[PDB]
């Protein structure tokens, strides 16, 4: 199975601007990328990339309608500033299970202002003193986190 097969199954061989969500899960990728998603995409709301072996974020269509994106179980470790230049309209961010070394990796999210929830589970950065407080004062725009900002609501 490949990203192309998932794209064909979800789109069912139709125009790219017909679905506002994608499910790219359990898909092998060339050197850890997210190919199979052409830049021609114009409308997209939800994303899902799990067990894709994504190692970096360097290929992504420019978008202005996406609000949620899901990355998990990946060895990606690099600056995410490119998201601002690609789609500065993210509201739900999920990095659960990813591999991030230190706090500097999550710095480039400051320039994004629409993010309200960020998820980081069993991450090497999560095991630090005052990581919760340090992240909060580092990303003032954030309104939610792993789930315990002040209360518990569901996405």
């Amino acid at each position: 199975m490949e990203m192309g097969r998932r794209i064909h199954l979800e789109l069912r061989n139709r125009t790219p601007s017909d679905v506002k969500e994608l499910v790219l899960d359990n898909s092998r990728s060339n050197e850890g990328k997210l190919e199979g998603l052409t830049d021609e995409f114009e409308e997209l709301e939800f994303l899902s990339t799990i067990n894709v072996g994504l190692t970096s974020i360097a290929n992504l269509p420019k978008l202005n309608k996406l609000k949620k994106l899901e990355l998990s179980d990946n060895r990606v470790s690099g600056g995410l500033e490119v998201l601002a230049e690609k789609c500065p309209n993210l509201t739900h961010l999920n990095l659960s299970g990813n591999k991030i070394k230190d706090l500097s990796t999550i710095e480039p999210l400051k320039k994004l202002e629409n993010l309200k929830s960020l998820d980081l589970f069993n991450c090497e950065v999560t095991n630090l003193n005052d990581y919760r407080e340090n992240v909060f004062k580092l990303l003032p725009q954030l309104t939610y986190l792993d789930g315990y900002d002040r209360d518990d609501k569901e996405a």
Partner: protein, 760 residues
């Protein structure tokens, strides 16, 4: 070879004797024909083998092309000869060629041994990883017991074992699969897949499977554990004057609980037998009906024995009274009604046994011999096994003996019932009274001097090995071995579940079962609404989801039609009991709307369909305007963890599509995927020639016969010409459904009794 087969057949028929015998003896009679061998068995195998090993070519090689791999004489050593043979019609050879083959020659495949000889390698694994301990040189007390020599993958009776073996490794000659392949479908498919890819002779595999399935049991002297794993090593573990510590490298409690629940459910109603058997054969334990572990173990709890009697199975004919297992030794007791005053002052009319009698008595780990006369216990011999078991044995034998002292020792009252709320006979009422208050007849029974002797030593009322014992009771420091001749004699079953001998005598009563509740260590999934309206909400949800899952094909087919008849199913009525009354209607309306949307504007999604279907049993209550209410969290009775998540999953229900698995009430089940493709993968076991019924005779209109692979090509409802068993041409029709004879019989009985009651 088939041409060689036909040529050999023609040559054999050329003689008139072959023609007359072949055309005379039917296929069934073939067995007799085979047994007419010379039987000139060697008188002394040792001498024969010794002489043969010194002969030039004792080995009898089968004619073939293998010999060309090896010369008739290698390195100046004679190996094989080209002289003809009369005994086997092959060639002759010597162990020299065998050793050379072990040295050089063709190299075979090593895969087959990984799985084919699974039992032997499992034995080796259990030996290697075992942990040894100290050795206790002191004397060891051993009891003779009927033990299973070797562990079994799935114990089954010999006939079922043979049928399963044939269904596994003999795809042909599989006419009309019985009511045994569906029970063992998982074993069938597992062994079929494992043994595929081999080239060993089929008879070897058949014998190995027989060893792996058919049970082997024997009388052995054992002390301590008794599972087959320990019996394998009994030769090293045990010892007359030495013992070793050994730890080799469940369903029972669940079946006990299920049988007890079935007994309690059926007793309260009239005609308990039919209802009990319906529930028993409609029950399942995680992969199989209850006739997969009941038929495995020998005997068991009284409830299991009663259920087996209700079903078709063999039960040990020991007399169960409360917990006592009694085996008569001699004497005949005349059961005559008599009026006896009880110690409480009341007078009861009950049956008493005139005449002397003796019984081997067992209870848990306690064994003994009891000798009783009418209205009196005479003698009791026991071994020290356990305080609880010894007390139970003493009290139960006391009550059974109907000793006048036991009656005069009553102090309270006897008006008890069971969990079903029924008044029992005075004997069982007294049993319960004395067991509840053990220190009632013990105090006034009277004491007897200690058994002055080399080994015979007494026991006091407190069960401690203390002298000044009870009148009659004696504890011998020896081993009492009892319960011989387990004839499994013919036993009848009355409607009220109480068994009786070939004569009118009663062996097991409906009330022998003890009213003790436990927790099923496994998913006890039934198939009848009547049963599961007892337990907790989680059990109800699990059973409803299992009912939905089992008959997924029918529900999925009815979904396409789009009619409300699909939703008005009795299976969900019990579910209605665990949904809040004030809000169930809103759930039903919301789920109905969601499922209509699913049918209209999207495609199949099994997980959400299963999740949302059951809540629609109750009538809907739409919004004032008319639109359905919307929810995302269905609350259930008990609150807290008893709640369903509409979106992805919850504690009671969570389906993961990455691996396509289903977790219900903390239990993982494999939904390979969706689609009739996954339906057929579920049907990947079953049995060869299971989708075809028999109808008509040869009917040569179809010409020659067709194989199973070509049989599948025919569309449902066609007619095909096939061979049944060893020949027997017949005409068959491909089935359009899956059948269950037990369900049909149960429904017929239900209709019959409904008619009887309505006329009455």
């Amino acid at each position: 070879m088939t041409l060689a087969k036909i040529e050999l057949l023609k040559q054999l028929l050329r003689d008139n004797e072959a023609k007359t015998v072949l055309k005379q003896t039917t296929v069934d009679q073939y067995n007799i024909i085979r047994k007419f061998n010379t039987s000139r068995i060697e008188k002394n195998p040792s001498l024969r083998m010794k002489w043969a090993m010194c002969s030039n070519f004792p080995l009898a090689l089968t004619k073939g092309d293998m010999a060309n791999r090896i010369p008739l004489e290698y390195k100046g050593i004679q190996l094989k000869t080209n002289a003809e043979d009369i005994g086997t019609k092959g060639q002759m050879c010597s162990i020299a060629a065998v050793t050379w083959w072990n040295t050089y020659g063709p190299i075979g495949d090593t895969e087959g041994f990984e799985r084919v000889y699974e039992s032997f390698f499992l034995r080796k694994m259990r030996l290697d990883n075992a942990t040894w301990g100290r050795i206790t040189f002191g004397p060891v007390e051993r009891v003779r017991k009927r033990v299973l020599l070797n562990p079994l993958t799935k114990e089954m009776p010999p006939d079922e074992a043979s049928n399963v073996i044939m269904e596994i490794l003999f795809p042909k000659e599989a006419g009309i699969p019985r009511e045994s392949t569906w029970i063992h479908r998982e074993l069938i498919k597992e062994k079929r897949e494992k043994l595929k890819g081999t080239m060993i002779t089929p008879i070897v595999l058949a014998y190995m499977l027989e060893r792996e399935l058919v049970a082997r049991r024997r009388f052995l002297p054992v002390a301590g554990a008794t599972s087959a794993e320990f019996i394998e090593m009994l030769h090293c573990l045990q010892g007359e004057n030495w013992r070793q510590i050994y730890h080799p490298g469940s369903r029972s409690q669940s079946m006990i609980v299920a049988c007890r629940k079935i007994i309690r459910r059926s007793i309260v109603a009239s005609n308990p037998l039919e209802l009990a058997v319906e529930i028993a054969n409609k029950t399942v334990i995680d992969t199989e009906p209850l006739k997969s572990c009941l038929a495995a173990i020998d005997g068991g709890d009284v409830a299991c024995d009663i259920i087996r009697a209700a079903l078709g199975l063999k039960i040990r004919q020991r007399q169960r009274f409360g917990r006592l297992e009694l085996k008569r030794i001699s004497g005949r007791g005349f059961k005559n009604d008599e009026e006896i005053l009880i110690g409480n002052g009341t007078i009861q009319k009950i049956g008493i046994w005139d005449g002397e009698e003796e019984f081997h008595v067992r209870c848990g780990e306690c064994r003994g011999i009891l000798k009783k006369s009418k209205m009196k216990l005479e003698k009791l011999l026991i071994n020290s096994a356990k305080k609880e078991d010894m007390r139970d044995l003493i009290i139960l034998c006391m009550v059974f003996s109907q000793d006048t002292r036991m009656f005069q020792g009553v102090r309270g009252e006897i008006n008890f019932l069971n969990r079903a709320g029924q008044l029992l006979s005075p004997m069982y009422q007294l049993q319960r009274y004395f067991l509840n208050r053990s220190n009632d007849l013990f105090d006034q029974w009277g004491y007897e001097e200690s058994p002055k002797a080399s080994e015979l030593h007494g026991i006091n009322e407190s069960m401690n090995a203390s002298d000044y014992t009870l009148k009659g009771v004696v504890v011998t420091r020896n081993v009492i071995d009892d319960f011989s001749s387990t004839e499994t004699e013919k036993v009848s079953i009355t409607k009220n579940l109480s068994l009786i001998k070939r004569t009118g005598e009663v062996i097991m009563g409906a009330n022998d079962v003890s009213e003790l509740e436990s927790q099923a260590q496994l998913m006890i999934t039934y198939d009848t609404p009547k049963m599961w309206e007892m337990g907790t909400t989680k059990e109800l949800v699990q059973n409803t989801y299992q009912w939905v899952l089992k008959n997924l094909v029918t529900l999925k087919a009815q979904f396409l039609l789009g009619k409300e008849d699909m939703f008005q199913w009795d299976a969900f009525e019990a579910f209605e009991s665990i949904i809040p009354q004030k809000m169930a209607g809103q759930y039903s309306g919301f789920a109905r709307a969601v499922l209509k949307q699913m049918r209209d504007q999207e495609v199949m999604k099994t997980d959400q369909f299963i999740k949302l279907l059951p809540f629609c049993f109750s009538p809907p209550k739409l919004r004032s305007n008319g639109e359905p209410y919307q929810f995302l969290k269905l609350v259930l009775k008990g609150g807290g963890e008893n709640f369903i998540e509409v979106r992805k999953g919850s504690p009671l229900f969570s389906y993961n599509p990455q691996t396509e698995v289903l977790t219900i009430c903390g239990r993982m089940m494999s939904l390979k995927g969706k689609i009739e493709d996954e339906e057929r993968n579920r049907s990947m076991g079953n049995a060869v020639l299971a989708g075809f019924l028999v109808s008509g005779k040869y009917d040569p209109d179809l010409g020659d016969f067709k194989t199973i692979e070509e049989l599948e090509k025919l569309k449902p409802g066609e007619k095909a010409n096939i061979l049944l068993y060893q020949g027997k041409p017949v005409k068959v029709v491909k089935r359009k459904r899956y059948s269950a004879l037990s369900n049909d019989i149960s429904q017929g009985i239900k209709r019959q009794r409904m008619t009887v009651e309505s006329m009455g």
